[PDB]
Amino acid sequence: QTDEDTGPVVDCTNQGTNPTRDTDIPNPRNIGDIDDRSCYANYSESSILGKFWGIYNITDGSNHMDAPNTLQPRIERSLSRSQATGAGSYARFRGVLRILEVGDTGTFSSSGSYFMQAMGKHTGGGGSPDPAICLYRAHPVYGDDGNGNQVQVSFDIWREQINFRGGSGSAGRTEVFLKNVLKNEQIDIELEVGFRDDPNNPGQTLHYADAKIGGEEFNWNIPEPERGIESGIRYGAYRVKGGRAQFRWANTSYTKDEVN
Ligand SMILES: C[C@@H]1O[C@@H](O)[C@H](O)[C@H](OS(=O)(=O)O)[C@H]1O[C@@H]1O[C@H](C(=O)O)[C@@H](O[C@@H]2O[C@@H](C)[C@H](O[C@@H]3OC(C(=O)O)=C[C@H](O)[C@H]3O)[C@@H](OS(=O)(=O)O)[C@H]2O)[C@H](O)[C@H]1O
Numbered sequence: 001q002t003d004e005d006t007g008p009v010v011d012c013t014n015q016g017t018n019p020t021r022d023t024d025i026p027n028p029r030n031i032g033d034i035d036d037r038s039c040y041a042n043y044s045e046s047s048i049l050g051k052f053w054g055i056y057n058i059t060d061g062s063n064h065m066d067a068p069n070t071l072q073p074r075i076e077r078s079l080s081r082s083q084a085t086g087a088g089s090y091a092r093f094r095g096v097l098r099i100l101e102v103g104d105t106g107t108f109s110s111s112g113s114y115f116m117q118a119m120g121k122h123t124g125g126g127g128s129p130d131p132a133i134c135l136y137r138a139h140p141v142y143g144d145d146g147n148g149n150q151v152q153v154s155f156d157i158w159r160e161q162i163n164f165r166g167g168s169g170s171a172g173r174t175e176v177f178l179k180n181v182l183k184n185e186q187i188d189i190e191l192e193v194g195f196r197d198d199p200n201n202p203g204q205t206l207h208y209a210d211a212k213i214g215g216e217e218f219n220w221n222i223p224e225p226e227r228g229i230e231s232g233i234r235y236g237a238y239r240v241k242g243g244r245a246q247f248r249w250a251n252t253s254y255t256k257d258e259v260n
């Protein structure tokens with residue numbers, strides 16, 4: 001059984017030209033509020049591999065909601081942010097991911113697509129008014145299909161992370177490789193963003209974004225814990241500067257705790 005889009009890559013389709021960002025189906029199984037900024041597809045679900053999957057498909061140039069030539073297309077769900085900075089504060093997302101395709105431009109720095117991200121505002125200015133903290137970006141790995149064609153067969157997952165609050169661009173962010181996953185392989189995902197007691201320090205605090213991907217932990221401390229005011233997560237599909245991205249999410253859960 002299959003839920004993969006295989007037709008030509010186009011910018012918009014009727015079935016995906018939603019009138020508002022909050023266009024959703026009745027009773028979605030994925031948790032969180034829909035934020036649909038792509039006219040290629042809408043959120044929908046499929047029943048396969050013994051699970052119910054939310055379907056996040058976006059294509060290059062399909063953002064009919066943001067002002068043109070600004071932000072990339074996306075279909076995401078946003079989760080209530082943890083608006084506290086005490087140790088023990090966290091946002092915790094869990095789910096099962098399938099990757100079927102990501103964007104590709106032929107150059108690493110503009111290739112790949114995000115399936116989740118950690119974000120949170122900070123004091124003191126710097127960057128955009130709703131700044132990213134780090135995003136989890138999947139890049140294509142090609143191989144043969146069995147008939148002499150190069151196609152996406154696996155995906156290198158990298159973390160695009162801030163060097164400093166609100167950082168963007170070559171100077172503002174660094175890319176860290178995490179691990180490879182196979183096309184259509186079911187991957188357990190956990191992402192927890194939060195504040196904890198700093199051991200190397202007293203009564204100071206660390207702001208972290210710790211992921212578990214297919215059983216392996218990738219932990220990371222956010223720069224300048226003291227400037228951050230909240231922890232937030234979004235997931236789905238975001239960024240496709242060439243071609244198409246297709247993410248599948250099953251059994252999503254979200255918890256948070258706010259501790260001062
Ligand atoms: C800032 C956004 O943050 C998140 O939301 C998300 O990761 C997003 O990624 S995205 O979905 O792929 O878009 C981030 O968006 C990128 O933000 C960059 C930014 O800092 O605003 C954008 O880069 C800026 O603009 C670039 C054009 C510039 O790159 C130089 O400029 C030109 C050009 O005008 O011809 C081309 C080349 O990009 C490069 O020569 C960036 O400069 S830098 O060299 O990287 O430091 C930067 O000014 C980026 O386009 C957004 O996608």
Ligand SMILES: [Ca+2]
Nearest residue numbers: 016038041042
């Ligand atoms: Ca849509």
